[PDB]
Curated annotation (Swiss-Prot):
Species whose genome carries this gene: Escherichia coli (strain K12)
SUPFAM superfamilies: HupF/HypC-like
GO MF, one example: iron ion binding
UniProt-listed Gene3D superfamilies: 2.30.30.140, 6.10.250.910
Gene assigned in the entry: hypC
Name of protein: Hydrogenase maturation factor HypC
Assembly and interaction partners: Homodimer. Interacts with HypD. Also forms a complex with HypD and HypE. Interacts with the precursor form of HycE (pre-HycE), the large subunit of hydrogenase 3.
UniProt-listed Pfam families: HupF_HypC
Disruption phenotype: Deletion of both hybG and hypC completely abolishes hydrogenase activity.
Amino acid sequence: MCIGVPGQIRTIDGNQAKVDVCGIQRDVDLTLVGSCDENGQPRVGQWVLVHVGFAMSVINEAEARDTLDALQNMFDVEPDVGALLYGEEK
């Protein structure tokens, strides 16, 4: 149900987008950031903090990567990371 993880805006459909949360795409509402950049460029390839099904903040690749490295640290230390990643518990 809940979510609070970085991902890449890997595809866009309208106000909704299909953010790859580093393993599978989730439908995410972009109202808080807009589906396009200020210059009208579609946000495809940009990164975003997904929280409760909304774009909490749009972020750069480096910010997402740093956040993911911190976030995974609690469980990447064990093979449980693989059981999660290749499982259906998410």
